[PDB]
Amino acid sequence: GHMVVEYCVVCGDKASGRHYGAVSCEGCKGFFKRSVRKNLTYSCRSNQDCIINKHHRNRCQFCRLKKCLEMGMKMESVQS
Amino acid sequence: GHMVVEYCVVCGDKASGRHYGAVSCEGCKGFFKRSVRKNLTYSCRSNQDCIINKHHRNRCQFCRLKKCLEMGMKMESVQS
Ligand SMILES: [Zn+2]
Ligand SMILES: [Zn+2]
Ligand SMILES: [Zn+2]
Ligand SMILES: [Zn+2]
Numbered sequence A, B: 001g002h003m004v005v006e007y008c009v010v011c012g013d014k015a016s017g018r019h020y021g022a023v024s025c026e027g028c029k030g031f032f033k034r035s036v037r038k039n040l041t042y043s044c045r046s047n048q049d050c051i052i053n054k055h056h057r058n059r060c061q062f063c064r065l066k067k068c069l070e071m072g073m074k075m076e077s078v079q080s
Helices: A026-037 A061-070 B026-037 B061-070
Strands: A017-019 A022-024 B017-019 B022-024
Touching: A017 A026, A022 A026, A026 A061, B017 B026, B022 B026, B026 B061
Parallel strands: none
Antiparallel strands: A017 A022, B017 B022
16 A cells, blocks of 8 residues: 655645645645735746745745646635 | 736646636647537546646546636537
């Protein structure tokens, strides 16, 4: 038999569960909820190609939100 | 000024346009059309709570069709 050990699709921290249609950590869930609810717009200081990992997840909020969307987190699942 | 860069509401792939009342990729448009036209019924092997992302979009057809409907894709907009 086997355990499936899920990693956050956005940053690679261990996930806490399924949040808005993506397997994610609490930090990325909270970041996504806040970005969607508050209609936050961000800009990447570089080439919109930043690395997102658990080290400094929030160094580039633009690229972190992009990765949420590319990894299938659903803005429309955030109740408002 | 800014660009709005739409993601498929069902899987998070880049959308190709508005199809049957939802911003969706070609794969999810085709899946929805076929599901509605052919009156396809599916069953989820798990707890009707599967993740839908671009990685293995069709791993759970039940959950993919549910997400199409939850995200506002309209069966009634599929011509017969
Ligand atoms: Zn994370
Ligand atoms: Zn960036
Ligand atoms: Zn799609
Ligand atoms: Zn399923």
